[PDB]
Write a protein that binds this ligand. Structure first.
Ligand SMILES: COP(=O)(N[C@@H]1O[C@H](CO)[C@@H](O)[C@H](O)[C@H]1O)OC
Ligand SMILES: COP(=O)(N[C@@H]1O[C@H](CO)[C@@H](O)[C@H](O)[C@H]1O)OC
Ligand SMILES: *Cc1c(COP(=O)(O)O)cnc(C)c1O
Ligand SMILES: *Cc1c(COP(=O)(O)O)cnc(C)c1O
Lengths: 810, 810
């Protein structure tokens, strides 16, 4: 149908059809008389999978032959989403499969909807790892993603009575056609035990053993025939395990629970033992795998020249002490040599400045679970502080501040400090974030080793986030500048010469309207809800957090509602406000915010006077597959976190690439997005980081705003009086109390500027032509936000490897 | 190579080879540079599996088209063993695959050794179900095997320091290529809850729900293109399950533990709740599946004409109350009509008279777990006793004896009584056993309904137990009478006309010697142990039990040892005594018997004076795959249970078919085997059932034998003094104490006759020609013991269906 989807050659379609029928018969053991859509989905998945094998096998032996420097990306999360369409796109098989299935009397689009999302992540951090894998394969890097194969990913969210209900994400129920178990490469992981000091070195003995079984998933690059590997570990109990008899076998579940479920707290620190076990589990198995591959290609001096280990936040921070343990205790290298190798091998990426997200493990936990590692950490700390003392003689408080060991109620190990000390590079994920790291949180470390600190602004893959989810937009773009931009997003800048092209302006607007119609239909089909396709689609989708300020959005919605009720017959630009996102199961306030959103909808959506001028919808179960549907349909992207709290953000980049204008604060990557597109083409409002600091020095008093802004006062009084909860008048008391007395994120402080900025958005929207021209200016300058640019920078500035665009043989 | 293994046609071998390489590449994702023997095994398994699919799909739709009466064999055990060779044999692909793999430079025999045994059974009962499935498919019956897919089958046995050690049988570790998950046919199973009595019927509410997910395994008939199904259920927790968050997800294991592990007590009753849950789990899921299939082909009057349910012992006895529950509570049939349907549908097979093997469930357990079923059982009992009272007016003790409810310390439900009341047929598994059932255990029931009682002597499949494990013997037989006997074992009688044929006599002896050499080699290769191939192979393999009397065998071995030490330079027929079998994990005495066997070996195998005239070996980890190796190599089969305790035995039949002579008591099927071959061709000894009863009436006093038999006294004194345990002098005190004061199985009573009988065995062995002629007379008359004969009798006399030999289309 469309160009960018590849060719549908006669011999290709014929081949696909026969292989489809072959899998349906021999693999699924069914025939078209009893086959259901799910059977058809699997037949298609196995057919497409077959086309990956040849490339996967030769890519890997290619690396074995050339022995390039290998990149290991360690992460506890990989938010992959669906794999079928992405694979077809990268292999240029989409139109051929579309034709083949069509000829078989099947709609490929409905078969794709059957696949379960691989939701092995919470949100931004997990999705970043996924985009990174796609870009590393596309850039021809010998990269490996290493993580945990969770039996249960992020929970599925259901809304009952306006409240969030959680249910297990049993994503492996029907099987996973994309993975390949490699039980033959199973490795042992040790826990507990004690340390023995012999004549020659320490020994970790009397340990409990848990096996790590790897499962490999292919990661195809964009049409370059490169297929890398994502290896995820699954926990298995040994067979001598617990060896009355029956109970011993049932207790095997104790050890296998390590890979059972993903913690769903959007990575806010919860010092639970199971979480620590997961972190060591991935680190221990991965490192053995890395060393094995290194020895099978003993001077470890060349180790850093053949290996790069990237720590995705501090979750895999134990890789530092574990690498030291292996080199010193097992390989017998002297400490200083082992440390040199470790530092040159490891690099650390920080993803947030929020204090409650930083990992600070109780010493007593490490002491019991990983005795040897605690000893190694103490030694690292001693030697590190000796260096600090030599550089800043007499500065005793600096020694206390920089220590890896934190004193107080209970001793804790600051994992961020451990990562900085043991890595040759430390980076933030957006310019403003990286600067904040050097000015505040890690100031002392920056002063000691300035050369270690870098910035690597985040990005998103244009394959999944443009070509896959918005073929219509990708097509009209390709018609003008070709298809080269798909792997070189900077070429989108060529579109600036079309900002005055009436034809292009019309097509851009047409694509958006089509996406909105498609989404409006979806809302009614799988969830039943009417929405005016001719209204402005105001969208805020991301995890529910106080720092992301969904509450500020709520205040604006209520303001719009009160103004309409005030002057019913006055004209206002119609809007359908959509808010979606999951709340951590034990985050009370986050759950109350979801309830408030639905409560507002209950009132607004049923007010006769409002009509179809304002609708408020809470998008249930926000996840990667849903993002692929709602983002292309958005007109306005809400990125309104308090300045200085959102390290980068990536959803913001997805909206920019898909034709939505952005209303937001100068926070995270928003700053760079506005710089690229031009401030006049962005809806910027609110306090800047400097303003937030001034307010804190003075002392934030929410009452001041309440007393000076009549419209704000009215909203609070409505919330407090039970206007949005007639049966439970004081239902939102906690929310009001927080806003009025302990709001760490200053919602009221940005209210006035936010509402005014929103008025300007509405003004531009009623002038279709100028709205679309601004959209074109945004799409045209979104090139910097391709994860291909991000990965190329990591490769050249941190890993020491040159990216390649050269395609491999088939 | 050999005839009975099929043809190796050019186009077949060529096709097999390419499909093998196809699976190695696309399915296993490997290439011959990194592939290991295990990869090769899987490539071959998938290749052979492909040839089953076509037949499997058409067999099933054939039944859907013809709508024949369906046979449902319910069992908690299916001891299948390996599937690769069996599949090739039944599809006539053995030689072709042998050639194809040969041409690829691979030895098929070593690839077959890689497959794990599907050990979903304890021993005889589980293996019988497996032989039955093979025969039902071979006889063209629309039969379905229904059971549980245990994650862990019977434990693997390791011998350490002469003691049994158990380890988890993680048979699914590397995957199971033979099964096909059918998650789409998942069904709910209810537990706990309470009963509500409404205006129209009772309702079972507030239950806990566990899902039953089926996995289908194909069961090919012998070269008739029929492929039936064995459906095994796996337990899965629902997704709303337990819905802090993390713990709720981890607690899912509580519900899934139902299908986690097979109880390894060789079916001796252990009233544990988990076991009861397993029994209801299989019954509830299976019945819903049966009714669904029945409704998709509502007068249930025809239900018995389209459905037959065979209960393999009382393990699935809840099928009776469950069928009543569904018909009465859900379908709304009146009780009497529902009962008529139930009785005509169900049939019960009893497998033992031993009291500690009978299921008697505590009422309080049923009361809590299955409230509605307990009420239905009480009603069944009331109505049944009303019938007894009418038939035997005034006989109050009969009412107490026949009640389904047993009174005493704790109320219990006798499941055997429930099965008799609710089945139209009840059978024993050997003539003597069935008679014993009518004369003792079930005498009262026989008097009330004589027409219900039948006999169905057990049998074994000649495919696995002759063609597969002993190709050499199958070949020399086929050379003389053709291959028709493989599916009509009675034709072996034609071999009687060859008992005087010098050529045949030589070949039979040659095949046995070859098998012994092959096994003798195996013993040294995987377990390292020397054995004289020219000695008599005396074998007793079966589960370790006091009733099977491995202890009697031990006394004979020690007697032989003492006689040699007595007259060192006297000639004696050389023997290598082999004993193997697993002991239930909590069966102390059984574990002490294993220790005694190894202890005797430690002394005998290292006595210079004995030399190679006597060897005692304990065969570790006895299982189906090992039986296939040792049985063809045996000369003497030990079947020495106390008369009246072994219901039938099936191992005895395997030895007879493979060229071993039998020494045994007139117990179980031994009686019929001797009748078929002729008493002069069997080594019969010991008390008959009548003799055992006379002894009990008089009172068994072991001391009497000890005082009158000098050789027996010497053995006991050696055991007691620490002769076989120098470091632990009183190690075998429990054994001696038992033999001397509380031996329920009268080991001493059969000692003298046993030793004398063994002398006659040795006498015949030193006359090779006459030994082989007697062997021929045994093989020639083993036809009655084919499970094809057994199944044909069940079909005609119980299920009401006619077996067929007609082959289906390809
Ligand atoms: C500790 O992980 P987080 O998920 N951190 C997130 O990482 C994402 C990926 O770099 C950023 O785009 C987000 O702005 C940031 O909040 O903690 C909240
Ligand atoms: C309750 O099951 P069992 O395994 N019973 C066994 O069933 C087998 C199959 O019919 C018989 O050949 C055995 O002689 C008998 O002992 O109990 C010990
Ligand atoms: C891109 C993405 C995120 C990150 O969104 P932000 O607004 O940067 O927090 C979270 N969840 C999903 C499913 C995503 O696709
Ligand atoms: C045949 C078989 C049995 C039954 O043997 P008996 O001597 O009848 O108890 C037990 N275990 C295995 C593995 C078998 O093959």
């Amino acid at each position: 149908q469309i160009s960018v989807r590849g060719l549908a050659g006669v011999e290709n379609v014929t081949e696909l059809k026969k292989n489809f029928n072959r899998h349906l018969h021999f693999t699924l053991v069914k025939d078209r008389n009893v086959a259901t859509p799910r059977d058809y989905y699997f037949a298609l998945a196995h057919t497409v999978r077959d086309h990956l094998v040849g490339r996967w096998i030769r890519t890997q032996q290619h690396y074995y032959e050339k022995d390039p420097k290998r990149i290991y990306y360690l992460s506890l999360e990989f938010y992959m989403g669906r794999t079928l369409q992405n694979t077809m796109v990268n292999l240029a098989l989409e139109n051929a499969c579309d034709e083949a299935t069509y000829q078989l009397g099947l709609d490929m689009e409905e078969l794709e909807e059957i696949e379960e999302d691989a939701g092995l992540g919470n949100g931004g951090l997990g999705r970043l790892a996924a985009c990174f894998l796609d870009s590393m394969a596309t850039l021809g890097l010998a990269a490996y993603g290493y993580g945990i194969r969770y039996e249960f990913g992020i929970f599925n969210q259901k809304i009952c009575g306006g409240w969030q209900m959680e249910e297990a994400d049993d994503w492996l129920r029907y099987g996973n056609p994309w993975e390949k178990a490699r039980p033959e490469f199973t490795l042992p992981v040790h826990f507990y035990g004690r340390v023995e000091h012999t004549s020659q070195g320490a020994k970790w003995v009397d340990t409990q053993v848990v096996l790590a079984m790897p499962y490999d998933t292919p990661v195809p690059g964009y049409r370059n025939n490169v297929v890398n590997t994502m290896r995820l570990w699954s926990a298995k109990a040994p067979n001598d395990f617990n060896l009355g008899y029956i109970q011993a076998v049932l207790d095997r579940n104790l050890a296998e629970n390590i890979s059972r479920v993903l913690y769903p707290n959007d990575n806010f620190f919860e010092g639970k033992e199971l979480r620590l076990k997961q972190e060591y589990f991935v680190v221990a198995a991965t490192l053995q795998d890395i060393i094995r591959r290194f020895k099978s290609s003993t001077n470890f001096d060349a180790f850093p020249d053949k290996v790069a280990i990237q720590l995705n936040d501090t979750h895999p921070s134990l890789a530092i002490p574990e690498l030291m343990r292996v080199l010193v205790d097992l390989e017998r290298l002297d400490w200083d040599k082992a440390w040199e190798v470790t530092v040159k091998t490891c690099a650390y990426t920080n993803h947030t400045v929020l204090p409650e997200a930083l990992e600070r493990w109780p010493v007593h936990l490490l002491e019991t679970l990983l005795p040897r590692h605690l000893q190694i950490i103490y030694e690292i700390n001693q030697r590190f502080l000796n260096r600090v003392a030599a550089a800043f003689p007499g500065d005793v408080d600096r020694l206390r501040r920089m220590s890896l060991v934190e004193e107080g109620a209970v001793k804790r190990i600051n994992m961020a400090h451990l990562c900085i000390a043991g890595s040759h590079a430390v980076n933030g994920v957006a310019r403003i974030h990286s600067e904040i790291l050097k000015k505040t949180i890690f100031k002392d470390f920056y002063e000691l080793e300035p050369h270690k600190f870098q910035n690597k602004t985040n990005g998103i893959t244009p394959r999944r986030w443009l070509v896959l989810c918005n073929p219509g937009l990708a097509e009209i773009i390709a018609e003008r500048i070709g298809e080269e931009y798909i792997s070189d997003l900077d070429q989108l800048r060529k579109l600036l010469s079309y900002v005055d092209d009436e034809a292009f302006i019309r097509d851009v607007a047409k694509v958006k309207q089509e996406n909105k119609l498609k989404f409006a239909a979806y809302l009614e089909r799988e969830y039943k809800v009417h929405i005016n396709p001719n209204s402005l689609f105001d969208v805020q989708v991301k995890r529910i957090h106080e720092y992301k300020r969904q509450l500020l959005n709520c205040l604006h919605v209520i303001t719009l509602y009160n103004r309409i009720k005030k002057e019913p017959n006055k004209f206002v630009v119609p809007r359908t406000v959509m808010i979606g996102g999951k709340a951590a199961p034990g985050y009370h306030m986050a759950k109350m915010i979801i309830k408030l959103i639905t409560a507002i909808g209950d009132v607004v959506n049923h007010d006769p006077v409002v009509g179809d001028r304002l609708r408020v919808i809470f998008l249930e179960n926000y996840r990667v597959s849903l993002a692929e549907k709602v983002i292309p349909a958005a007109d306005l992207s809400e990125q309104i976190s308090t300045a200085g709290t959102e390290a980068s953000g990536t959803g913001n980049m997805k909206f920019m690439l898909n034709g939505a204008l952005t209303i937001g604060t100068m926070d995270g990557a928003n700053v760079e997005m506005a710089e690229e597109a031009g401030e006049e083409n962005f809806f910027i409002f609110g306090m800047r980081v400097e303003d937030v600091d001034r307010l804190d020095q003075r002392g934030y008093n929410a009452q001041e705003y309440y007393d000076r802004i009549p419209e704000l006062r009215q909203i609070i009084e409505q919330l407090s009086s039970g206007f949005f909860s007639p049966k439970q008048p004081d239902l939102f008391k906690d929310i009001v109390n927080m806003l009025m007395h302990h709001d760490r994120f200053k919602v009221f402080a940005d209210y006035e500027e936010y509402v005014k900025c929103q008025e300007r958005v509405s003004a531009l929207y009623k002038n279709p032509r100028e709205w679309t021209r601004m959209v074109i200016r945004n799409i045209a300058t979104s090139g910097k936000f391709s994860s291909d640019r991000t990965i190329a920078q990591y490769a050249r500035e941190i890993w020491g490897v040159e990216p390649s665009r050269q395609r491999l043989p088939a």
